[PDB]
Amino acid sequence: GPLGSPIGALASALANSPPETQRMMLGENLYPLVDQLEHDQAAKVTGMLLEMDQTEVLHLLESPDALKAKVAEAMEVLRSAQQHT
DSSP states (O other), rough: OOSSSSTTSSOHEEEEEOHHHHHHHHHHHHHHHHOOSHHHHHIIIIHHHHOOOOHHHOOOOOOHHHHHHHHHHHHHHTTSOOOOO
16 A cells, blocks of 8 residues: 555555645745745735645646636736725
């Protein structure tokens, strides 16, 4: 069954930790990869989606085109005003 370590390797579900737990965890390794810009706004778009949407976490911390999607929306709320009056 297990190849390396007992846990995780034995069960795939074991590795499938909560989105928030993985969030920073994957972004920790992949965010630096995905992390397009400086953690300032970069950490928000790339690493935040890591728990927001399953499709986004997978897409954002793996694909570049994924960044354009969240960055435009996310960077709008941070870099730009929040909603309209």
